[PDB]
């Protein structure tokens, strides 16, 4: 399903100054509502394709960009996922990941359902 | 290349060049991940990749700041330091 193409849909959620503090929690972190507006109806070859445009939009949001230090800002500017804190990594999974809160319907592109998580939160892939 | 076995085979200047290569981030993503993995292997610092991506507020977010924290932490924990070069 992550390798299948499709159309971005949904609203996202309002987000403050400690956005990815939620990434390791039960909920994970939501797609910021304003980021959600910029991706709606775009078509994606696979979920890896959505991931790149998402982090690019995050880098262009000053309120989100400043929640990262210099090296992570350079990554998201290039569409790469930021490094997660070392304690929140799992082996070679060093970077924040995009996952789904609830079952995907017949989907993977529903931005009400997409969560940013730490590798550790999503340890059992 | 003369092979590195530990961080003590690096002069501080050589290690700063290595950290600047990482900070420059001109490599492929795969190469960048392998450079950070090697960085952690060499420093043995429990912060791991946090020295690069989640630096503490009380030093410079720069290769020089990273090398300074590694140098001070390793010395205080009775670990081997950098090779002395011809600056000494």
Numbering used by the authors:
A (entry chain B): 4 to 109, 112 to 130
B (entry chain A): 1 to 88
Which passages does the manuscript contain on this structure?
The colE proteins are nonspecific DNases, which are produced by Escherichia coli to eliminate neighboring bacteria. To avoid autotoxicity, the producing cells co-express Im proteins, which tightly bind and inhibit colE’s activity. In the colE/Im system, comprising four homologous pairs (colEwt2/Imwt2, colEwt7/Imwt7, colEwt8/Imwt8, and colEwt9/Imwt9), each cognate pair forms an ultrahigh affinity complex (KD < 10−13 M), whereas the non-cognate pairs show non-protective affinities (KD > 10−10 M). Our results demonstrate that the design of substantially different backbone conformations, orientations, and sequences at the binding site generates dozens of new interaction pairs from a single starting one.
